[PDB]
From a paper:
There has also been some evidence that avidity of the bivalent Fc has a large contribution to FcRn binding. This suggests that monomeric Fc, without additional half-life extension technology, would result in dramatic loss of binding to FcRn. We report here the development of a therapeutic platform for the expression of a monomeric Fc fusion protein that exhibits FcRn binding affinity comparable to the wildtype Fc. We devised a comprehensive protein engineering approach that involved using a unique IgG4 phage library design and thermal stability and folding selections, in addition to a pH-dependent FcRn binding selection, to identify a monomeric Fc with excellent monodispersity. Our results show that a library selection strategy combining thermal selection and rational template designs can lead to monomeric Fc fusion proteins which have the desired biophysical, structural and pharmacokinetics (PK) properties.
Residue numbers in the entry:
A (entry chain A), B (entry chain A), C (entry chain A), D (entry chain A), E (entry chain A), F (entry chain A): 235 to 444
Amino acid sequence: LGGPSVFLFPPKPKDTLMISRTPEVTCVVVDVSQEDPEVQFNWYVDGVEVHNAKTKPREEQFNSTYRVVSVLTVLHQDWLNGKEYKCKVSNKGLPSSIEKTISKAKGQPREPQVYTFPPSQEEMTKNQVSLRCLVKGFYPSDIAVEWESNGQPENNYKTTKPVLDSDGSFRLESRLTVDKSRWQEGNVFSCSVMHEALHNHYTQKSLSLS
Amino acid sequence: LGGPSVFLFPPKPKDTLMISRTPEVTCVVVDVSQEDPEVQFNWYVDGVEVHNAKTKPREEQFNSTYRVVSVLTVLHQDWLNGKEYKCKVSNKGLPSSIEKTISKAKGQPREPQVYTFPPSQEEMTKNQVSLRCLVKGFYPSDIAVEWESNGQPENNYKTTKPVLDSDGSFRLESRLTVDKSRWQEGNVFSCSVMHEALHNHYTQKSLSLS
Amino acid sequence: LGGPSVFLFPPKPKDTLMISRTPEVTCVVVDVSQEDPEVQFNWYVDGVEVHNAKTKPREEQFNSTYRVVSVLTVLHQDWLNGKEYKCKVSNKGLPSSIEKTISKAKGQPREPQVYTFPPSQEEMTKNQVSLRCLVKGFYPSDIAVEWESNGQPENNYKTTKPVLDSDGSFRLESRLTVDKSRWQEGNVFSCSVMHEALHNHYTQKSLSLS
Amino acid sequence: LGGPSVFLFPPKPKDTLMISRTPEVTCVVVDVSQEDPEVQFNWYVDGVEVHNAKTKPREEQFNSTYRVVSVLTVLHQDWLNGKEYKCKVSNKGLPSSIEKTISKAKGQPREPQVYTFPPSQEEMTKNQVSLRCLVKGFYPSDIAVEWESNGQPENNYKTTKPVLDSDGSFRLESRLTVDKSRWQEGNVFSCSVMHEALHNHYTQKSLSLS
Amino acid sequence: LGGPSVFLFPPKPKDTLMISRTPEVTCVVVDVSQEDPEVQFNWYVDGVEVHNAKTKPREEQFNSTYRVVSVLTVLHQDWLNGKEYKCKVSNKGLPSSIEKTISKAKGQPREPQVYTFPPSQEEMTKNQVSLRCLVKGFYPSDIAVEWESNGQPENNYKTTKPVLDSDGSFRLESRLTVDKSRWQEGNVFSCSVMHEALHNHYTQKSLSLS
Amino acid sequence: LGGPSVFLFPPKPKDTLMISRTPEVTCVVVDVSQEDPEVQFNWYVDGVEVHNAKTKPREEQFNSTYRVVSVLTVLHQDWLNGKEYKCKVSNKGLPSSIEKTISKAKGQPREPQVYTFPPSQEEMTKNQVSLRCLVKGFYPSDIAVEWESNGQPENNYKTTKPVLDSDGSFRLESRLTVDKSRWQEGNVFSCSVMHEALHNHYTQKSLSLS
Ligand SMILES: *[C@@H]1O[C@H](CO[C@H]2O[C@@H](C)[C@@H](O)[C@@H](O)[C@@H]2O)[C@@H](O[C@@H]2O[C@H](CO)[C@@H](O[C@@H]3O[C@H](CO[C@H]4O[C@H](CO)[C@@H](O)[C@H](O)[C@@H]4O[C@@H]4O[C@H](CO)[C@@H](O[C@@H]5O[C@H](CO)[C@H](O)[C@H](O)[C@H]5O)[C@H](O)[C@H]4NC(C)=O)[C@@H](O)[C@H](O[C@H]4O[C@H](CO)[C@@H](O)[C@H](O)[C@@H]4O[C@@H]4O[C@H](CO)[C@@H](O)[C@H](O)[C@H]4NC(C)=O)[C@@H]3O)[C@H](O)[C@H]2NC(C)=O)[C@H](O)[C@H]1NC(C)=O
Ligand SMILES: *[C@@H]1O[C@H](CO[C@H]2O[C@@H](C)[C@@H](O)[C@@H](O)[C@@H]2O)[C@@H](O[C@@H]2O[C@H](CO)[C@@H](O[C@@H]3O[C@H](CO[C@H]4O[C@H](CO)[C@@H](O)[C@H](O)[C@@H]4O[C@@H]4O[C@H](CO)[C@@H](O[C@@H]5O[C@H](CO)[C@H](O)[C@H](O)[C@H]5O)[C@H](O)[C@H]4NC(C)=O)[C@@H](O)[C@H](O[C@H]4O[C@H](CO)[C@@H](O)[C@H](O)[C@@H]4O[C@@H]4O[C@H](CO)[C@@H](O)[C@H](O)[C@H]4NC(C)=O)[C@@H]3O)[C@H](O)[C@H]2NC(C)=O)[C@H](O)[C@H]1NC(C)=O
Ligand SMILES: *[C@@H]1O[C@H](CO[C@H]2O[C@@H](C)[C@@H](O)[C@@H](O)[C@@H]2O)[C@@H](O[C@@H]2O[C@H](CO)[C@@H](O[C@@H]3O[C@H](CO[C@H]4O[C@H](CO)[C@@H](O)[C@H](O)[C@@H]4O[C@@H]4O[C@H](CO)[C@@H](O[C@@H]5O[C@H](CO)[C@H](O)[C@H](O)[C@H]5O)[C@H](O)[C@H]4NC(C)=O)[C@@H](O)[C@H](O[C@H]4O[C@H](CO)[C@@H](O)[C@H](O)[C@@H]4O[C@@H]4O[C@H](CO)[C@@H](O)[C@H](O)[C@H]4NC(C)=O)[C@@H]3O)[C@H](O)[C@H]2NC(C)=O)[C@H](O)[C@H]1NC(C)=O
Ligand SMILES: *[C@@H]1O[C@H](CO[C@H]2O[C@@H](C)[C@@H](O)[C@@H](O)[C@@H]2O)[C@@H](O[C@@H]2O[C@H](CO)[C@@H](O[C@@H]3O[C@H](CO[C@H]4O[C@H](CO)[C@@H](O)[C@H](O)[C@@H]4O[C@@H]4O[C@H](CO)[C@@H](O[C@@H]5O[C@H](CO)[C@H](O)[C@H](O)[C@H]5O)[C@H](O)[C@H]4NC(C)=O)[C@@H](O)[C@H](O[C@H]4O[C@H](CO)[C@@H](O)[C@H](O)[C@@H]4O[C@@H]4O[C@H](CO)[C@@H](O)[C@H](O)[C@H]4NC(C)=O)[C@@H]3O)[C@H](O)[C@H]2NC(C)=O)[C@H](O)[C@H]1NC(C)=O
Ligand SMILES: *[C@@H]1O[C@H](CO[C@H]2O[C@@H](C)[C@@H](O)[C@@H](O)[C@@H]2O)[C@@H](O[C@@H]2O[C@H](CO)[C@@H](O[C@@H]3O[C@H](CO[C@H]4O[C@H](CO)[C@@H](O)[C@H](O)[C@@H]4O[C@@H]4O[C@H](CO)[C@@H](O[C@@H]5O[C@H](CO)[C@H](O)[C@H](O)[C@H]5O)[C@H](O)[C@H]4NC(C)=O)[C@@H](O)[C@H](O[C@H]4O[C@H](CO)[C@@H](O)[C@H](O)[C@@H]4O[C@@H]4O[C@H](CO)[C@@H](O)[C@H](O)[C@H]4NC(C)=O)[C@@H]3O)[C@H](O)[C@H]2NC(C)=O)[C@H](O)[C@H]1NC(C)=O
Ligand SMILES: [Zn+2]
Ligand SMILES: [Zn+2]
Ligand SMILES: [Zn+2]
Ligand SMILES: [Zn+2]
Ligand SMILES: [Zn+2]
Ligand SMILES: [Zn+2]
Ligand SMILES: [Zn+2]
Ligand SMILES: [Zn+2]
C-alpha cells in the first residue's frame, strides 16, 4: 500500500531436496518508476551480509513501471537448518529502504506416509486409467511428488496443494493418467516423494535371471 | 609403550549413515591395575566439554588388569560435518592424563559407483550360486554394503575391506551366495550401498497390474 | 498419553521485562511412581548444556504419584533475543528420555497503545467507581499491566487475557475499582504497561512550587 | 605528527540510548592533499568487515587541505554490548593504511541517582529563576540530561561535563532557567536523565477528575 | 566489607609466557566460618561454564576462619587473546553468591627495549660487582626478567616493580650481583626478558673453532 | 586437463613464522585467452568471504595466453591455527567457476632438534670449509633455516628439502661454506631454525668484560 513494493519467495521444494540442484531465494521489486530506474539489493544470511546474489536485467511492465529481480543461491544444508535470508531494497522512489526476511517453516519434521491405489473396475472401461498416490502425515508442507516408470519420468500427473489435516500435518494426492494398455501390459509405475523428513544415504542396484 | 593405554574408535559406518540410528565414539582404556580401579573420562566436541557419555561397567582381563570403556553418542550431522571428538582419561596408575582425538576422514567426498554381475555359466552347475556387487570410486572409505530380496534382508554375503585405488578413491566387492533354485525362480536381488556421498530426501512406492 | 509426562512453562512476563528480576523457565514432571522416585534433568540453551538449574523437592500427589519440578534462571537479554530452552527428563519408569523446548514468541514486536477512561456519569452514583485502561496493538502477547497512585501500587484491578485482533496484534482491558471518594478528591491514577516493545533507558524527577 | 591524520568519534549518548534513533560512529580524515583527493575506508565490527558506511562529500579546508568523513550506523544492542568498531583509512599521500578502533567504556554499569532542587529564596527576587538537577553515581560517563514541562521540551538549560568522583563514578549538574511567573503559577518541571543503567520496558498513562 | 570475601588473581607472567608451563587463575575465599565449612565454585570462560578447576584442601586461619582456594588452569593462547575468567563463590554464610572476573590488561602491546650496563670503576673496588639491566617501553606491565651465564641460571638478582612512564609504557631495572672475580675472568652474562610483545618461532645453535 | 587452470600456493614458511612479516596465499590462474581477458576472484576464510585481496596486473604468456595472480594477506595466528583459505575463479572462457582451498598441514606439531658439526680434518686442507647443521624430528615440514655470524646474516648456504623420516617426522641438512681463514680466526657461526613448534616470548642481551 504505497511505493515500489517487494516480495521474497523461497526456493522450489525440489531444489531444496536434491543436493545436485541449486536452490535460490528470489527478491522481486515491483512498481518502480522510469524516473528512478536503478535498485540496490543488500542480502544477509542470519544478519551477515553476503555477496553472491545476481540481479536479473530490469524489464518494463505494461503499466509503465519496472520490475527488478535479485536471486540469491542458498546452500542445501543452510536452508534446511533454518538460516534466515533477508533482502533489503533501495531505490530513488523510496525514501527509506525496505526489507523482507524468509526462512524454512519451523516445527518438528514429520515423515510422509505414502499409499498407492490402482484404477477402479469402473475406471478401466475407458481408454485411459488413473493411478493414485496419497501422501499424508508430513511436516512441513514443502514437498515434491513425481512419477516414473522403467527408469524414465512420467509427467502426465496432477497433484493437489498440501491441505492441513486435523493433527497439524499436511496431506495431498497425486494422479497419473496413462493409456489403459500400458497399465494392462504389466508396466510398473512408481509414485516418488521428496521431503526433508526422508533423509538417507542409500542406493541400490538389482539383479535377476534375465 | 608403558602405562595404562587408550584407544579411540569411530562409529560404525552404518550407524553414521542411517539417521534413525545412534552412532557412538568409543574410548577404551586397557592395562589398568586392581590397585587403581577407577578411571575418569572427560569428553570434548571441538574442544567444548560435553556430559552425555556413559561408562560401561569395568571388567577384569585375564592378565590381571582391568579394561574400562566410555561411549559417547554423536549427532548424525556433527560427525559427517567433521567435528573432532576428544577423550581424556585419568587414572591413579597414570601420573598425567592421556588424551586421544578422532574425527571423520577429511577430503572431497566421492560417490560410489555400483555394478552387479550374475553368476557365470560355470558357476551354475552347482547347488549354490554367487552374486557379485562391485563398488568403486568412493571417498572416504567408510561404507556399508548389504543385500536384500523381496523386502527382506539377505545376510549370506562376504564383503572385502576397502582397497585404495590408483586415483585415491577406494574399491570393494561383495558376494552373496544363495541356492541356485532361488536365483532360477526369478527372484530379484539387490545390492544396497550406504555412503555419505549418496545423500537424498527421496522415497517411492510402486504399483502394477497384480 | 502414557508414562510420566512433562510440561515446560515460560517465565512470567513481569519477570522478563524488569531487569531487576529473575525470570525462570520451569520444567514439571508429573505421573512419576513411588517405584522410581528419582528424576534427572538435563537443560540446554540453544543446544548447549548448562548447569545452573535447581530441582525443587519432590512431593506426593494425592493420586499416589509424585510431581518433580526443575527451574532454570534465564538471562534477561537471552530470553528476549529468542534463545531456545530445552528440558530433558530421565526416569526409571520411562524407557527413553523425554524432551521439551520453549522460547519467546517469534514475529515483529509491536508497541502497545494505551488509553484510559474515567468512570461514566452512570458509574458515579455508586460508592465505588471503576477506571478503565485499554491496551491494543501489541505483539507478542506477553504483557504485564498494573496500576498505581501516589507512588504506591493499586492492586484492586482485573485484567482480561490478551485477545488476538483482526490485524494479528493482541488487545486487552484492565479495570481498577476504587472508592468514589478517592477519585472525587482528585487523586491521580496511572495505568502501567510493561511490554518488550517499550524499551527505554530514561527516568525523570519532577519539581513544582510546593 | 606527520601525514594525513584520522580521528574516530563515538555516537552521541542520546542516540545510543533511544532505540528509535540511529547512533553512528564517525571516522574523520584530515590533512589530505589536493594531489591525492581520494580516500578509501574499510570498516570492521569485532574484526568482520561491514559495508554499510557512507562517505560524506569531501570538502576543502581553508589551509589548502581536504577533510573526508565516513559515518557507520551501529546497532543499538551492539554498541551497548561492547562491540569494537574499526575504521581503516587508505590514501595516495599515506604510504601505509592507518587504523583506529573505538568501543563503549568498559566497567560495571552504575545507575544515576537524580535529585532536584527548587530556587533559593534569594533566587526568587529576580524575574528568572533557576531549577537544579544533580545527577551522581553513574558509570560509564555517557549520559544525556534534558528537561520538560507539560509534555513539551524545555531547552533553556546548561549542563556540566561529567566529573569523576572519589568512588570512580561520575557526577554532573543541570540548571534550567525559566520565567519566575511560570514557576509561580505551579507548572511542574521534570529533569529527564538517559543512561544505559536505566533500562526498562515500561510506560504509563494517567487519569484524574478533570 | 562484611561477609566471607573473594579475591581473584591472574597467572604469573612467566607461566603465561612459556608455552611449556601451566598458567592458572586463582580464586581465594577468605573469612569463612566453621559453621559453614563448604564452598562451591563455578568458573566461566567468556561466560561459558568450564569444569577443570581444582579446589585445594580448606585450611583454618589463625583468626578462627577458613580460607578456601580454587585454581583454574588457563590455555596459553586464551589468556593472551584476552578471554575473561570468572569465579563465582557460594557459601552457607553468604546469602547470595559473589562473583569476580579477571582478564589480561587491554591496550596495544609494546615491545620492551633492553639495555645492559657493566659495573662502574667505583663499583669494582669491591669483592662483588653488580650488573644492570634496564628494560623500558613495554606494555602491558606483565613481564618476567631473569639472568643467566654459561647456559645456567643466575638467581642473585633484584628487579624493581614496573613503573608507569610519562608515555604510558612501563619501565623497570634488574641488578645481578656476582663475585668480581667471575666478571674479571670474562664470563658472559645475559639479561633475559620475557614479554608478550616479544613473539618468535626461532632457535639457534652456534659453532666455533674449539 | 582442459580450460584455464588454477593453482593455490601457501605462504613462505619464513613469512608465517615472523610476526613482523606479511604471509600471503597466492592464487594463480593460467591458460586464459585474449578473447576473455578479465578474471574475477572471490576469497573465503573458513567459508566467509573476505575483501582484502589484491590482483596483480595480468600479463601475456609467450604461448598466447594470459596469467592472472591474486594475493591474499593472511593473519599470523589464523594461518597457524588452521583456517582454510579458498580462492574461487570466474572467467568468460570458463563455463563454471573453479575453486581451490589451502590450509596448513594438520597433525601434532613436533619440535625440531638441531645439531651442528665443524669441518672434518680432511675438509680443512682447502681454502674454504663447510659448516653443517642437521635438523630432525620436526612436524609439519614447513621450516626456514638460515645462518649468521657477528649479528649479520651469512647467505652462502645450501639447505636440502625436508625428507620424511621413518617415524613420520621430517629431516633436513644445511651447509654454510665460508673462507677457512674466517673459521680459523675463531668467529662464531650460528645455524638459525624457525618452525611453528618453537614458540617463545623471550629475548636477551649479553654483557662481558670488554
Ligand atoms: C503493475 O504491474 C505489475 C506487473 O504485474 C503484471 O505483469 C504482467 C507481465 C502480467 O503478469 C500481469 O497479469 C501482471 O499484473 C504489478 O506487479 C504485481 O504486483 C502484485 C501486487 O503488489 C504482486 O502480487 C503479489 O504476488 C504474490 C505471489 O506472486 C507470485 O504469483 C503470481 C501469480 O499468482 C505471479 O504473477 C508472480 O510472478 C509470482 O510468481 C512467483 O514468482 C517467484 C519469483 O520469480 C517464483 O519463485 C522463484 O522463481 C523461480 C522460477 O523458476 C524459481 O522457482 C526460484 O527458485 C523461486 O525462488 C515463484 O515460483 C512464482 N510463484 C507462482 C505461484 O507463480 C503474492 O504472494 C502476494 O500476496 C501477498 O501480498 C498481498 C498485498 O501485497 C496480501 O494482501 C496477501 O495476503 C499476501 O500477503 C502475504 O500473505 C502471507 C500468507 O497469507 C503472509 O504470511 C505475509 O506476511 C503476507 N505479506 C504481505 C506483504 O502482505 C502479492 O499479492 C504480483 O506478484 C506482481 N506481479 C509480478 C509479475 O511479479 C504491479 O502491482 C502493477 N501496478 C499497479 C496495478 O499499480
Ligand atoms: C495425578 O495428579 C497430578 C497432580 O494434579 C493434581 O494436583 C493437586 C495438588 C490438585 O491441584 C489437583 O487438582 C490436580 O489434579 C496430575 O498432574 C496434572 O496433570 C495434568 C495432565 O497431564 C497437567 O495438565 C497440563 O496443564 C498445563 C497447565 O498447567 C498449569 O495450569 C494448571 C491449572 O490450569 C495448574 O494446575 C498447573 O500447576 C500449571 O500451573 C502453572 O505452573 C507453572 C509451573 O510452576 C507456572 O509457571 C512457573 O511458576 C512460577 C510460579 O511462581 C513462576 O511463575 C515461574 O517463572 C514459571 O515458569 C505457571 O505460572 C502456572 N500457570 C497457571 C495458569 O497456573 C496445560 O497447559 C497442559 O495442556 C496441554 O496438554 C494437554 C494434554 O497433555 C493438551 O490436550 C492441551 O491441548 C495442551 O497441549 C498444548 O497446547 C498448546 C497450545 O494449545 C500447544 O502449543 C502444545 O504443543 C500442547 N502440548 C502438549 C504436550 O499437548 C496440560 O493440560 C497438570 O498441570 C498437572 N497438575 C499439576 C499440579 O502440575 C496427574 O495428571 C494425575 N494423574 C492421573 C489423573 O492419572
Ligand atoms: C588544516 O585545517 C584542518 C581543519 O580544521 C579547521 O577547520 C575549519 C573549518 C575551522 O573549524 C578551523 O578552526 C579548523 O582549524 C585541521 O583539522 C583539525 O586537525 C586537528 C589536529 O589534527 C583536529 O584535532 C583533534 O580534535 C579532536 C576533537 O575534534 C572535535 O572537536 C573539535 C573542536 O574541539 C571540532 O573542531 C571537530 O570537528 C571535532 O568535533 C567533533 O566532530 C565529530 C565528527 O563529526 C562529532 O561526532 C560525530 O558527529 C555527528 C554530529 O551530528 C554526530 O554527533 C555523530 O554521531 C558523531 O559520531 C563530535 O560530536 C564533535 N565533537 C565536538 C566536541 O565538537 C580531539 O579529540 C583530538 O585530540 C587528540 O589528539 C591530539 C593530537 O592529535 C592529542 O594531543 C590529544 O591529547 C588527543 O589525543 C587523544 O586523547 C585521548 C584522551 O585524552 C586518548 O585516549 C587518545 O588515545 C588520544 N588520541 C590521539 C590520536 O592522540 C585532536 O586534537 C581537529 O579536529 C581538526 N578539525 C576538524 C574540523 O576536524 C588540520 O589539522 C589543519 N592542518 C594544519 C594546521 O596543518
Ligand atoms: C582472618 O585471617 C585471614 C588470613 O590472613 C592471615 O593468614 C595468615 C596465615 C598470615 O598470612 C596472616 O598475616 C594473615 O593476616 C585474612 O585473610 C586476608 O584478608 C585480606 C583482607 O580481606 C586479604 O587482603 C587482600 O590481599 C590482596 C593481595 O593478596 C596477596 O598478597 C598478600 C600479601 O600482600 C598475601 O598474604 C596473599 O596470600 C596474596 O598473595 C597472593 O596469593 C595468590 C593466590 O595464591 C597468588 O597468585 C597465585 O598463586 C600461585 C603461587 O604459586 C601462582 O602464582 C598462581 O598462578 C597465582 O594465580 C599471588 O602470587 C600472591 N601474591 C603476592 C603478592 O603474594 C590485595 O590485592 C587486596 O587488596 C584489594 O582489596 C582491598 C579491600 O578488600 C582494597 O582496599 C584494595 O584497594 C584492593 O582493592 C583492589 O585494588 C585494585 C587496584 O588497586 C582494583 O582494581 C580492584 O578493583 C580492587 N578490588 C577490591 C575488591 O577492592 C586485599 O587487601 C588477604 O590476602 C587475606 N590473606 C590471605 C593469606 O589470603 C582475613 O581477612 C582475616 N579476618 C579478619 C581480620 O577479620
Ligand atoms: C602456457 O604458458 C604458461 C606459462 O608458463 C610459462 O611461463 C614462462 C614465463 C616460462 O616460465 C615458461 O617456462 C613457462 O612454461 C603455462 O603455465 C604453467 O602451467 C603449468 C601446468 O598447468 C603450471 O604447473 C603447475 O606448477 C605448480 C608449481 O608451480 C610453481 O613452480 C613452477 C616451477 O617449478 C613455477 O614456474 C611457478 O611459477 C610456480 O612457482 C611458485 O609460484 C608461486 C606463486 O607466485 C609462489 O608462491 C607465492 O609467491 C610469492 C613469491 O615472492 C610469495 O612466496 C608468496 O607468499 C607465495 O604464496 C611459489 O613460491 C613458487 N614456487 C616455486 C617452487 O617456484 C605445480 O605444483 C603443479 O603440479 C600439480 O598439478 C599437476 C597437473 O596440473 C599434477 O600433475 C601434479 O601432480 C601437481 O598436482 C598436485 O600435487 C599435489 C601433491 O603432489 C596434490 O596434493 C594436489 O592435489 C595436486 N593438484 C592438482 C591440481 O593436480 C603444476 O604442475 C605452471 O606453474 C604454470 N606456469 C607458471 C609460470 O605459473 C601454461 O600451462 C601454458 N599452456 C600450454 C602449454 O598449453
Ligand atoms: Zn563482505
Ligand atoms: Zn545425512
Ligand atoms: Zn558443562
Ligand atoms: Zn539433505
Ligand atoms: Zn537498550
Ligand atoms: Zn530489556
Ligand atoms: Zn606465532
Ligand atoms: Zn605465545
